Symmetry: C7
Subunit: 267 residues, 7 copies
């Protein structure tokens, strides 16, 4: 007439005392990871830490409940494989929904750690470009000129192209009619290059004229370029453009107006 | 002649009393999570809470049924691995169909918690732009001017670019014929910048003229820009455009009409 | 000389009596879930319910067969892990092919439950727009003007933008030559706004003229807008367009004809 | 000196007699599911059923071999988890390669069961449009006018838009110069609407003129529309187009020729 | 002082004799599946069968090694779950990398079995079109006119549209100026239809004129169509085009030259 | 007072001697698979084989460590399921990161084995075209004319279209004004066909004129085509183009200059 | 009255002493893998190594905690399958989030090992082109002219096309009016080819004229090409362009101006 109900009550008593120990233990650890991060009130307000700490506490309570519960269910002869094919709906949903969060974190870790870019560089990252403002661990902030502030999760960084770095390149493609006199234009472009090499202090390499970079229908295109100091690219381009307009005027050279020629019939 | 039928009836009696205890226990917990969320009738109507609470109750009944059932099946010597390869069709279908729901909730949690944007900012989020109206946990609402109200699930937020924030940037690209007189145009643009810096109180930085931002075929393009107070961008741009038309008129300057030039043959 | 063949026949007899019990039990449950949903013949015809109920019954028969079978196979010393790596082909194929069905259902549940839109609103949902006609749980129906009836599964709803709701916005972008007289045009547009504010009862806000919304090459574009009652947007726009044509006529103002200017050589 | 070799030979004898029983059992079931589907020679030729039945038989033979084999391997002390990590290559490859097949079947089941469309409707399904010819369970056939016969697997049906159904809408967008006389044109369009309302019997709603649906550069566009009987849409549109050309002729109205205006310099 | 070393050596001896038996057994089965497929040298050269058979043999050797090895490792008290988390790297990599192969085979099976197309039809399959040359089980070959020979794996077949089949449709959209005389043109097109109905034997339905299929700016488009025998579509279209050019000539009708009209200022 | 510490030390001694045996065994196998592949120094340099063999050795050391370790951890009563949920992070990451590698190898195996193309054919493969230079097992090399050398991993081959093979097709679409005289042009094109059939030895089929392949606005297009020897396509097309220009000259035929016709107003 | 509490305290003492041993063991191994990589301060600063080593240490502490903890939880009768469905959320999230890291490493290994490109070549890799600056194991650095520095993770390398290598090809497509004299133009192009073959030392093959590579509307296009030394392509093209402009001038040949011809009506 059975004396195993003893081992039974022993076990359910073990599960209960261990779940209690675990709960108090965890409320202690959450309170400590609380107060230690609470008085050095740097990275977070006591409104966020509150909701975050409450969130941690609730997660640990529910986990501990589920565990004690399924263990005690095991004791009343419920099958743990069926219990697994039910709890595994949550294992799967959460486990996979969280993978983006983990991808963000790993990616961010390498962005920060490989110094792919620092809190001031101008970068183009996934078709969007701007000046980096914050580098978080999960998320990166980047303010374009006029574009507004872009907030990009780190997992979404396919390629990150960094302008700046070891200086930028400024480039102007100026187009003339094919029609036109090449050597005159090229000599005038070089005069602009010299005037700008003297007149600026942000440029490290150029300006330089390199040949006919392109030829098509009724226009031929020549390129001037120049290595500039970080964030000066556009200033230099705008300057070169102004001077090129001026040189179109003084040197009396035709503008690259589109140029058709038509045959006539009257009827 | 066997005296194990005792341990057998003992077991199936344990499964049944535990499934009963679990069902009553859960109907109690659902009734409490019911009435506690029921008289503080804030976020939900008693039509929604009804269907939602009925839904929870039915899910717990079906889970408990499945558990008791598979355990009793285990008792009649049915294999739990085959039972698993059957129940796992549901574990997989539900577990993965729900991963979007979980992704939404994680993403939403970070949107709210990192204050990526507040209930008033103007944001562009996945090619769609508008003024945010609700920030849920699963879903975000965003009303574009004329666009209608966009409802976006949170898991679908690749990048969220926020305009507004620390002020916007207003930009006008005005285009003149290459043909034209640069310094006159630039000086007049600066007169418009001064008149607008005086004439407005929403601007915090500009307006400012920066050089020849672009040059092509028969037009050259100059840019004025100006940091404005949140949501004033467009007002400022429209103002600057009006003034620039006016200045085209008074200063007598040619409009940037497309400009071909054609050669003739008669035949 | 063995007396375990007894426990053996006992077991296979247990598996058989349990599979029998399970089959009768389920044909009973299917017959009840049948007749209860059968005389309240609302949502389904007795041709659909027949094929659906037959389908349920066959699924339960095949599952029960597979279970009894794999258990009896376990009894003749067949390994349940190899049996698992065979049955798991079906666990995987079905479990994952069904995940879209589950995704549809979850999504649909939230569409209905968050009242994202009701059986009358005009919505644009994944590049397709129309008037919603049915809101199912798995699938949504939406009839565009001329487009035909679109049937969209719920899992395919990335964003659902809802026009209507708290009223629509009607917008007309009218374009004039840059060439033209701005204040005359604007005053005339305001006369059209006043005449339409008087002459209609669907509009709740506009009409209103806001500045030069755009300026380019040989055209400048002005915008009139107006908040209208649900589904009136287009009536209002068509009206404003008519009146704007009329105002081009009476006020004698040039149409925005594209405007080149060409230089001549003869040869 | 061991008397367990008895239980050993007993076991391998059990695995063998059970694999034999299983093979004969299955060849019987395949032969019956053969002859029963063989004399009602409706949906399949005895060339297809032959290769399909041969295919079923071989699959069951190979599965039964693998099972008996891995069980006997278990008996010579081979580990079933390593055996699992080998067989699972096939469990995974097949299990997942077959998921499209399962997706097709589920989708098709719902297409047929929700009567999303019947064997005659004209549907646009994933950018492709045509008249449905067969509705299978795995695959749908749809013949476009001139397009050829499209065969679409059911799992690939994102949205299925069905034209026809509760009648179609025929739409003509006729464009006139802005230049032109609106009320004359509108009255003439209404005369065409009346003449067509009289002259046809396939239309159920229109034809109707609704206002200036669009206005741009040198054209303004008016829309006539009309609900028609299934598959008459295009007949009605072609008719309305013919009559509109006729009305351009008789009423002497200018065609919407693109309309530039150009300024001259000679040089 | 232990007499279990006997059962130990017994076991490792069992694993060894079973791995030996399995290896000889498999080399026999590979040699037979070799010579049986070797003298009926149809589908394969004895250079392919050699490398394929060698490949099979090596796979079976390595699998048998891994099995015997992990079993003997189990015997020296190595844990099979850790062994599983190592071998499962290969289970996963291979199991999933092979899923495309399995997808190809399933898809190909259905293409062949549902006779979606035969070794002569002209099909468009995933944006690519051509005449089918081989129908494999894994891969399909399709030679476009000028395109070269396309080799498409079967798993990549989303939709397969088959032209040919129950005949093709040939279609010519001829465009006239709006300017023009409709009934003359239509009557002339019908004369071309009659002359071609007489003059060909590949057509089964047309040719036929159906109305104004389109109207825009300065062109109106009329469509002639005709059901033709498989692969004749293009011959018919080219013939109809030639005849339509001839009819433009004889009947003296204006070609659909783009038609602007321009206003002049001199300055 | 326990005499199981004996079986304990026995076990950990078994794990240690088996890990030692396994390590020496593997360093031997690596040294042999080393020296055997080392003196037939064909496919690899002794710098690659060094780093590759060192890599193999380190992988086997770490695997053997992990196994011995987890087994000894099992002995001190550490749970192997928790150990599994930790090691499985690596099982998953590696197992899935390697699936591309396996996909490449399978695909490459079939490319090589089905002789889809050989080391000289001109192929277009995923939008990129070129002449194949190497066919590896993991990766394929393909050098475009001017394009540079493309290196494509095998798993990335959706479709591979092979030009060459049973000869190429050369195609020239020449366009004339609609305006023009069709039979003259066609007869002249045939004279070019004959002159080229005589004048070349790389062509196997053409050249041939087939009708009006296209008719539009102000141009009608005729096609000449011809089956050529592998890699001659372009030579033939270039030749036919030259001759067609020559024939435009001699036969005095109008070029297909775009052809508008304009109406005039002065104001 | 139980004497198993002895084996109990024995076990938990075993778990504790093994977790202690493992912790000290690991802090030792981390300190060694620290100091050995610390004084050879090459690839890393002692700021990075610090944070990386601290990171390793913390990871191993948390893993060891989780293990000891779950083992001791197993001892108080907590179920390890439920414990597995909780820890598996992390196994899944981390295991899958890290798969990109693994993919990068494998890919990079093959890039380095197959010398697909070296630290100087000019490559186009996923639509982005530039000169390679660093080849890491996880990530590749590539600086475009003007483009800025692109940092690409290795897993994102679909195809990597390498220009340079066995020399580059420089290509110029020059276009003339159809109108024009072909043999004159071709002979002149050949004179430019000869002048450039003499005048350069970077070219290894060309320059060479090959026929009418293209013919259309009012232009015909001829191609000159030439194999050049690595990185000279563009110099050569720019030179050939300059010379071709010069040759348009001297030889007096018409530029390829777009060429319409128009018919007149006055009204």
């Amino acid at each position: 007439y059975d004396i195993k109900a003893v081992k039974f009550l022993l076990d359910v008593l073990k599960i209960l005392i261990i779940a209690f120990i675990g709960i108090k233990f965890a409320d202690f650890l959450i309170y400590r990871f609380y107060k230690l991060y609470s008085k050095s009130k740097i990275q977070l307000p006591q409104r966020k830490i509150d909701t975050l700490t409450s969130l941690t506490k609730n997660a640990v309570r529910y986990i501990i409940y589920f565990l004690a519960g399924a263990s005690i269910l095991k004791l009343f002869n419920i099958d743990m494989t069926s219990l697994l094919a039910v709890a595994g709906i949550g294992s799967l949903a959460i486990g996979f929904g969280a993978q983006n969060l983990v991808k963000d974190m790993i990616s961010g870790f390498f962005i920060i750690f490989e110094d792919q870019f620092s809190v001031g560089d101008y970068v183009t990252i996934n078709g969007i470009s701007g000046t980096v403002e914050e580098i978080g661990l999960r998320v990166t902030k980047i303010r374009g000129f006029s574009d507004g502030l872009h907030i990009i999760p780190n997992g979404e960084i396919k390629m990150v192209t960094n302008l700046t770095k070891d200086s930028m390149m400024a480039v102007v493609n100026i187009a003339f009619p094919i029609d036109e006199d090449v050597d005159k234009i090229i000599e005038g472009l070089q005069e602009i290059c010299e005037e700008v090499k003297k007149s600026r202090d942000d440029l490290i390499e150029g300006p330089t004229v390199l040949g006919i970079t392109d030829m098509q229908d009724s226009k031929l295109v020549i390129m001037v370029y120049a290595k500039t100091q970080p964030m000066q690219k556009w200033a230099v381009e705008r300057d070169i453009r102004y001077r090129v307009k001026k040189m179109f005027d003084q040197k009396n050279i035709s503008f690259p107006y589109p140029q058709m020629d038509v045959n006539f019939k009257r009827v």
